[PDB]
Amino acid sequence: SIDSAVATYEGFSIRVHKYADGDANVQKMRFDLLPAYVCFNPHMGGQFFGNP
Amino acid sequence: TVLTKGEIVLFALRKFAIASNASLTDVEPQSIEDGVNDLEDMMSEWMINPGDIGYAFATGDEQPLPDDESGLPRKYKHAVGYQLLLRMLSDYSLEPTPQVLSNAQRSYDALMTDTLVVPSMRRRGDFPVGQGNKYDVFTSDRYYPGDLPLIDGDIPN
Amino acid sequence: TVLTKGEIVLFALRKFAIASNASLTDVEPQSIEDGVNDLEDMMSEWMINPGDIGYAFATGDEQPLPDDESGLPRKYKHAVGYQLLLRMLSDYSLEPTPQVLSNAQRSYDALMTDTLVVPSMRRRGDFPVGQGNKYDVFTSDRYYPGDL
Amino acid sequence: TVLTKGEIVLFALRKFAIASNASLTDVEPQSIEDGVNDLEDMMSEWMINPGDIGYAFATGDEQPLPDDESGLPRKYKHAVGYQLLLRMLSDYSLEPTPQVLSNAQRSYDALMTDTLVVPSMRRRGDFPVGQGNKYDVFTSDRYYPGDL
Amino acid sequence: TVLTKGEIVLFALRKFAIASNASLTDVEPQSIEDGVNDLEDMMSEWMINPGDIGYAFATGDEQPLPDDESGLPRKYKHAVGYQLLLRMLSDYSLEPTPQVLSNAQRSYDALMTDTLVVPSMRRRGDFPVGQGNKYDVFTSDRYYPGDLP
Amino acid sequence: SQIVLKKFLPGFMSDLVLAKTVDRQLLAGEINSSTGDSVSFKRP
Numbered sequence: 001s002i003d004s005a006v007a008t009y010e011g012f013s014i015r016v017h018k019y020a021d022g023d024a025n026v027q028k029m030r031f032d033l034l035p036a037y038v039c040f041n042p043h044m045g046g047q048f049f050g051n052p
Numbered sequence: 053t054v055l056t057k058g059e060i061v062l063f064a065l066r067k068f069a070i071a072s073n074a075s076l077t078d079v080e081p082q083s084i085e086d087g088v089n090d091l092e093d094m095m096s097e098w099m100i101n102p103g104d105i106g107y108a109f110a111t112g113d114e115q116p117l118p119d120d121e122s123g124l125p126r127k128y129k130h131a132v133g134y135q136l137l138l139r140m141l142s143d144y145s146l147e148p149t150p151q152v153l154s155n156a157q158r159s160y161d162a163l164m165t166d167t168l169v170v171p172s173m174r175r176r177g178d179f180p181v182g183q184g185n186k187y188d189v190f191t192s193d194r195y196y197p198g199d200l201p202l203i204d205g206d207i208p209n
Numbered sequence: 210t211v212l213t214k215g216e217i218v219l220f221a222l223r224k225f226a227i228a229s230n231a232s233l234t235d236v237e238p239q240s241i242e243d244g245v246n247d248l249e250d251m252m253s254e255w256m257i258n259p260g261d262i263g264y265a266f267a268t269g270d271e272q273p274l275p276d277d278e279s280g281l282p283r284k285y286k287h288a289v290g291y292q293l294l295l296r297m298l299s300d301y302s303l304e305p306t307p308q309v310l311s312n313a314q315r316s317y318d319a320l321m322t323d324t325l326v327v328p329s330m331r332r333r334g335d336f337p338v339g340q341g342n343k344y345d346v347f348t349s350d351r352y353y354p355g356d357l
Numbered sequence: 358t359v360l361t362k363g364e365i366v367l368f369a370l371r372k373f374a375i376a377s378n379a380s381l382t383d384v385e386p387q388s389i390e391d392g393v394n395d396l397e398d399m400m401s402e403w404m405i406n407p408g409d410i411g412y413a414f415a416t417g418d419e420q421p422l423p424d425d426e427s428g429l430p431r432k433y434k435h436a437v438g439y440q441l442l443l444r445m446l447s448d449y450s451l452e453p454t455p456q457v458l459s460n461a462q463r464s465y466d467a468l469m470t471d472t473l474v475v476p477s478m479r480r481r482g483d484f485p486v487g488q489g490n491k492y493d494v495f496t497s498d499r500y501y502p503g504d505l
Numbered sequence: 506t507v508l509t510k511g512e513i514v515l516f517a518l519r520k521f522a523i524a525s526n527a528s529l530t531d532v533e534p535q536s537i538e539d540g541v542n543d544l545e546d547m548m549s550e551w552m553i554n555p556g557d558i559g560y561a562f563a564t565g566d567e568q569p570l571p572d573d574e575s576g577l578p579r580k581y582k583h584a585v586g587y588q589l590l591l592r593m594l595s596d597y598s599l600e601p602t603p604q605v606l607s608n609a610q611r612s613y614d615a616l617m618t619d620t621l622v623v624p625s626m627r628r629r630g631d632f633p634v635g636q637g638n639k640y641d642v643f644t645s646d647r648y649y650p651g652d653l654p
Numbered sequence: 655s656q657i658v659l660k661k662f663l664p665g666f667m668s669d670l671v672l673a674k675t676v677d678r679q680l681l682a683g684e685i686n687s688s689t690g691d692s693v694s695f696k697r698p
Contacts, residue, residue: 005190010670018190023202036685040677040695053566066539069598073535082231086223096283101319113210127549130592139287142309145226152595162554239378243371253431258467270358296435299457302374645657653656 007031055126058118061087063129064137068152070144086143088116091136103167127166131159174198212283215275218244220286221294225309227301241275243300248293249273260324287312288320331356360431363423366392368434369442373457375449391448393421396441408472432471436464479503508579511571514540516582517590521605523597541569543593548585556620584616627652 007014015032061084066072071079095107108123110116124132134156141148177198187193218241223229228236252264265280267273281289291313298305334355344350366389371377376384397419400412413428415421429437439461446453480503486492492499514537518524524532548560561576563569577585587609594601630651640646684693 003190010673020200023200036681038681038695053568067593067596069596072596073533073539074597080231086230093283093286097287097316097319100284100323115210126546127552129546130550138308139312142224142306142312143226143229147306148308149595149600151591151601155592155595159550162550166553237378243378250431250434254433254435254464254467256432257471272358295456296460299372299454299460300374300377301379304454305456645660650656 054121055124055129057088057091057116057120057122058084060091060122060129060133060136061118063133064140067133068137068141068146084118087136087140088118090140091132092116094136094139095132102164105163105167128163131156131163134159210283211278212281212286214245214248214273214277214279215241217248217279217286217290217293218275220290221297224290224294225298225303242272244293244297245273245275247297248289251293251296259321262320262324284323285320288316291316358431359426360429360434361423362393362396362421362425362427363389365396365427365434365438365441366423368438369445372438372442373446373451373453389423392441392445393423395445396437397421399441399444400437407469410472433468436461436468439464479505506579508575508577508582509571510541510544510569510573510575511537513544513575513582513586513589514571516586517593520586520590521594521599537571539596540589540593541571544585544589545569547589547592555617558616558620580619581616584612587612 002017002019004015004017007016012033017030017032018027020027062071062079064070064087065079065083066074069075069077070083071077092109095109098105098107105128106123106125108121110120134152137152138148138156175196175198177196179196181187181193181195185193221244222236226232228234249267252266255262255264262285263280263282265278267277291309294309295305295313332353332355334353336353338344338351338353342350367376367384369392370384370388374380374382376382376388397414401414403410403412410433411428411430413426415425439457442457443453443461480501482501482503484501484503486496486498486500490496490498515524517540518532519526522528524530545563549562551558551560558581559576559578561574563573587605590605591601591609628649628651630649632649634640634647634649638646680695681693685691
């Protein structure tokens with residue numbers, strides 16, 4: 001029971017919602033996204049800098 | 053400076069020559085308390101018929117003091133004083149003169165002019181919005197937004 | 210500061226200079242109890258035409274005292290006092306004056322503008338509901354409820 | 358409270374200052390009897406034009422007494438007192454003042470406002486009842502009774 | 506030729522012949538100060554209905570003084586003096602005369618004539634500008650701008 | 655100070671190279687309503 005829409009940017013879909021909580025002419029919009037991460041092997045990457 | 057209470061009563065007393073240096077009469081302390089009580093009663097009544105004008109009521113439960121500050125702007129002193137003078141003239145069983153009535157009417161009219169607001173009638177709510185406004189879905193722009201019911205969820209039913 | 214009874218009576222007596230704090234000659238307490246009884250009867254009558262303004266009638270059987278709490282808001286003090294003065298002046302063989310009448314009328318109008326309601330007229334109950342309201346066939350939503 | 362018949366006469370006498378504490382005058386016994394009799398006659402007459410208000414009359418040999426209950430509510434006291442004062446002032450040959458007249462008419466208007474009933478007209482009796490009322494199974498009325 | 510607060514009060518007293526520099530009797534100094542306060546309050550009230558007329562109020566904290574400079578142009582002297590006279594005449598238990606009332610009304614009308622402004626109703630905002638005004642040289646001129654917000 | 659153009663001024667924008675390089679193949683449509691709030695892979 002809330003009107004919404006979907007916006008896509010670089011292959012990421014963003015859910016946008018609209019509602020009018022409060023009767024002081026105060027509209028509200030919100031955007032959501034939920035990612036997930038995983039580290040397979042720590043021994044295959046890291047940091048580096050220069051050496052003298 | 054600061055428009056204190058009590059001196060507004062002195063204003064009316066002087067203006068009708070109840071107690072002023074012009075008539076050589078001295079102020080009676082028994083009348084000033086009645087004047088201040090009448091002033092507070094008249095302002096309390098004025099809270100509804102005209103709008104609020106910034107009057108500061110006595111905090112707590114105690115009688116007012118004649119030397120406290122009223123808080124009213126200096127542009128309302130004539131109006132307030134003339135109104136309370138008209139309301140307390142009957143105490144001494146005296147009849148006001150036409151010039152005093154005219155001055156009080158003029159001051160009251162100016163005060164009412166100051167705190168004036170005219171409402172504007174907004175759209176009904178079922179009034180269509182023309183095609184030239186380019187309405188769109190996901191927005192309620194198809195029709196004019198009336199007064200929202202503000203009843204949602206389980207508490208409406 | 211509560212607006213107790215008898216304070217209204219004292220105000221009404223003062224505003225016509227019958228008796229006040231500065232009067233050398235004062236009035237007997239029988240007049241004061243008569244005044245509070247008149248105020249009680251006036252409020253009982255006001256329960257009809259102007260409406261209900263939260264007056265606290267005496268309960269049980271004891272008579273109204275000149276010291277009990279009336280419970281009225283402060284804003285109604287001048288209106289009540291002027292009405293009591295108008296209904297009470299004839300007791301002392303006196304006649305009112307135009308300025309007092311104008312003040313009483315203004316105070317009464319200020320009191321009356323609070324109780325205004327302006328009722329709204331609901332639908333007839335046989336009026337059809339527009340088909341664009343998306344009613345339900347079996348829920349009897351094709352017509353307005355009317356009243357009750 | 359009980360609002361005895363004696364109280365009403367005393368209120369009217371106190372008004373206009375015929376017998377009151379403020380006037381430093383005491384009430385004569387005969388005036389009380391005359392006032393009670395006039396109140397009885399007035400309330401007997403009021404059974405037709407204003408209507409019934411629940412006043413209690415004596416039984417058999419009347420002999421109304423000031424200590425007898427009246428049965429009136431506290432609201433109608435002012436109206437009854439002012440009407441009695443208007444009908445009784447002619448005994449002492451006194452012309453009423455305009456303020457008393459205004460008070461009396463205002464109280465009487467409030468009293469008549471309290472007991473106002475507006476009759477509602479009904480259908481003739483040969484008026485048809487439409488097909489929308491389902492006069493086959495929902496009702497047997499092809500026409501309104503409308504008379505009672 | 507600089508109008509002061511105090512000479513306005515003296516003008517009001519003189520015009521109705523309470524103090525006239527030759528009256529063999531003078532008014533107490535307290536009445537002059539009270540007249541100055543009345544003038545200040547009245548001309549502060551004048552900030553709403555008549556409007557601004559270049560009045561210079563007192564210092565942010567100091568009390569007004571009779572010798573203080575007012576800044577009112579000389580053309581407003583009669584009007585302000587007659588208004589003050591009407592506003593404080595009853596202080597001495599008095600009443601005006603028809604000729605004084607007529608003079609005060611004439612002065613007040615003369616004052617109001619100078620400070621009169623008649624606004625002009627601009628276009629609605631959705632009203633269209635016709636093809637008579639070539640609007641192609643501009644990107645957005647096909648309709649009137651409307652009143653500034 | 656009244657007429658305003660309908661085109662916004664340009665702003666600042668970062669760049670995206672990190673997301674395009676990491677592995678977005680093994681984990682794709684794996685956290686469903688049945689798997690739960692976590693999922694695991696094997697090891698050699």
